């Protein structure tokens, strides 16, 4: 169902859309690489912190690597809950450490990476102008040029 992109650019009002889509994907590739770098960095520390609490947290949280991936992925969208840091053993020190770590990850990663992405995309846009028609024409040319020979 996603393979429909072949027969999309032949139309008028849809080419430049697809072209800028591909451009922004190729751009955000590198931001994705840096974000997964920092993701790995935070997730290893978060799996080491609660490695010796099997059945001590409120929810089934920060017990194995798969679960750490789950929570740190689904918190990027606000779908994960803060109650995934509360404990049952008192150990107030480790509890504050975890709250601090989770918060600082949240702020740093999410906010700074998003603002970097958008400011740099407006940067990469403002330098190149008026040739989107040209790029759409080149793409459409490849498209209905591939139908001639055989």
């Amino acid at each position: 169902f996603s393979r429909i992109a072949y027969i999309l650019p032949a139309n008028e009002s849809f080419g430049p859309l697809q072209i800028s889509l591909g451009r922004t994907v190729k751009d955000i590739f590198k931001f994705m690489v840096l974000f997964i770098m920092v993701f790995f960095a935070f997730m290893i520390g978060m799996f080491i912190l609660y490695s010796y609490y099997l059945g001590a947290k409120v929810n089934a949280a920060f017990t194995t690597v798969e679960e750490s991936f789950k929570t740190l992925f689904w918190s990027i969208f606000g779908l994960s809950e803060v109650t995934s840091v509360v404990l049952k053993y008192d150990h107030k020190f480790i509890e504050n450490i975890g709250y601090v770590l989770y918060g600082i990850y949240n702020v740093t990663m999410v906010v700074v990476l998003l603002n970097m992405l958008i400011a740099m995309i407006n940067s990469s846009y403002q330098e190149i102008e008026d040739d989107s028609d040209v790029e759409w024409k080149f793409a459409r040319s490849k498209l209905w040029l591939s139908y001639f020979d055989d």
Binding site: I44, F47, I48, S51
Partner: peptide, 21 residues
């Protein structure tokens, strides 16, 4: 990371950070 998941590794990490310092 190897020390993370399941005595020598502990001392090696300590020696490495002492070298950094």
């Amino acid at each position: 990371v190897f020390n993370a998941s399941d005595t020598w590794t502990e001392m090696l990490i300590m020696v490495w950070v002492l070298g950094m310092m």
